[PDB]
Subunit: 163 residues, 6 copies
């Protein structure tokens, strides 16, 4: 069973207690940034707001999935209302469409929409060129392994980089 | 490999040329309505518009999927901007969120929002109850089998009713 | 005095207490759906929310018109933001415009927008053709008597059918 | 046959060729303001833009009704997206809801939304006090005759001031 | 230090307690109309709602700026979602953009968009003709002094009038 | 004469011909990103589309300003339609509000909404604390000099950092 949840869960990891991410930012669940501010207290304050209860830095399985969903919806929404993204998104198959959401989920709609070239190659279904072009990005550099898997997906149209 | 496409492919079928649906309405692709008007001519016009070329009632696989993606985006956009529907949707797991999308794709966001008790039940994770409450709708009557599979999906949160 | 209220009042009926509609769905006022769920308790819940008091399934005249207005506003709003509908709507006379609102009130914007052909005929003012075309739909089948009247209004642009 | 059209037609009048209104502003059809600028050539430019053809300052009946409708839609749109107006609008009867529209048609949503007290009284069906309170506005002063009729409509709930 | 606040502060004045404006309308802060209704009690209502506390018709500086900012946001939003205005607004320099905002803050987006010619002349940077043309309006007539300064901002592109 | 324009012009620079920005991304005007794609041809493509003419990688003063205006409006739009940001934005004075827009123009609304603590401190007018707090972010790190001036503005409520 593979989807955007199972995909991202292993790209962003799933944690049930507040942790500092690659950039020391307070995070929880599946790559959910709580706050940029270096205050554990502010993180719990934000998390309490997000979950709607006194969590004291610890949430449940179902709660992190709920947070993940809110994030994903924001990403899908980002795609559906960016004129550079939607048309590309609409031309992809289910499996590849998830690799686009994964990108947007990671770096925001504006970030992903900047890949002017890769985006056209993808729309024209020229995967191999799209793979090497994306491999030439700051994205690929700051997070090589994840980018590999996403790019592999784009190139194969299968879940092989995750199975 | 399961997802909303493979799911809806077997609930709406996949057709490469215009046919009349269960209600004599000109359709193509994956349950894509072209027009309520009883004129094969107006249907090709709509289809010509949608695909962006002279199709003469015949389309390709990619074109059908592209058309499907546009319909799904409309269904997800229906769920996200529906106060009644988003909270429920966000509380569901991957597989079970597919079931909800399926329901909207079939009957529109308003229709689905109409299931007051069933929605709350799902949001509280009382699957069994939701199943029996959903099996009591005009929806279940008019399309018993489809609802069975979708309800089986809500109840087990798995792709069993399709795989 | 004829208008969309009096028009829809007699196409959808006006009932001061909850009732199961043509499809076993709990309803009140002027064809106002409360809930698809088979539980009169849920119906009274939604109704309490909407009306803003403890109704126990019974509302007043004014309360039903308030519930009617909210529904209509949603039909008009659905037309005014439907790229296919608004141009047609804007090309109709006061009376015939209501007949369009009527249809949307009955099946929604995406429903009415489906009648591609008839729509263009109406905006072109070829009434009689629009009549026969609409008379060939699942809409005309499921609810013959009403469609007849609505279509009649499109054809004559008057309140004769009512 | 009475409605918002026939009502505004006799308060705003119906003209087939550009005319200066009460304030020396270029107008046409049913109170359709074309421009504030004192340029007949500027007026004819907007009209050519609005009608979609070379009108040379002259339109048809249907072209004025189409223009009228778009102005009505703008007013109804104004009401339904005004937190202060929609709840009062929803509380009126078909006939009185027309009166409200007439006001918004004449002075916009912000103008009408200003009559704080008269609006409450209307939402509380205290018609006769709303009449006197509206009879005390700059609106009633600048345009006495029209206000009377509209205010009469608000007070009786009938088309008497126009029948 | 010049900007839209310092500008509008001196065109609409800043008051910390309800006052009747030029047309006898209850107002506060920076030209913030409270109610057209002739009731001091109705105005204290709106204000209390606007600020979120029992003000009894008296607010603070910060409460008048907060109320000013929301007024300015509504103006900028009106401009950014009006097809006639945004292209003109996006063609102006920082200073001349304040002047447009001002106008919309005073008379709303509809009123400002009614200046067909003066709007095109602005987009075309033909300032002087925009000046003489805006001076012929009811706007200028009803509020001469404020109009002078604003138009002057359109003609020089500097804060000289302020 | 100071304002968001004169402020951002000296932070983002003003160039009339496409250049690679700090990260090797094709840019023009005032920090306007054309494309993440490593293609000068792609950059000229986007540029042609935005400006709407045959630019060959060169624009006028006015075209830059127009471009800048659009970017600023997007940033302000972002703030205004963000529940975390608008209420803080509405609490600031004209001078400090420009600093917020500056941050949003640089890193987008989401990134700026991330500073949970700093934001609230600005809403409570504890400028000095917001200053130190903000100087502890990745933002201050990657772009020290710019952050200095923007944070100075937040602290003094004056244009001193730019005069
Ligand atoms: Cl079935
Ligand atoms: Zn949306
Ligand atoms: Zn709307
Ligand atoms: Zn907006």
């Amino acid at each position: 069973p593979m989807n955007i949840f199972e995909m991202l869960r292993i790209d962003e990891g799933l944690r049930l207690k507040i942790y500092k991410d690659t950039e020391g930012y307070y995070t929880i669940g599946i790559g959910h940034l709580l706050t940029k501010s270096p205050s554990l207290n502010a993180a719990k304050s934000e998390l309490d707001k997000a979950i709607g209860r006194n969590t004291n830095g610890v949430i449940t399985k179902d709660e992190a999935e709920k947070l993940f969903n809110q994030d994903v919806d924001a990403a899908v929404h980002g795609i559906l209302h960016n004129a550079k993204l939607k048309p590309v998104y609409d031309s992809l198959d289910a499996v590849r469409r998830a690799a686009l959401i994964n990108m947007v989920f990671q770096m925001g709609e504006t970030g992903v929409a900047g890949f002017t070239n890769s985006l056209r190659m993808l729309q024209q279904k020229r995967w191999d060129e799209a793979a090497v072009n994306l491999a030439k990005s700051r994205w690929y550099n700051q997070t090589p392994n994840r980018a590999k898997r996403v790019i592999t997906t784009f190139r194969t149209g299968t879940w092989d980089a995750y199975k």
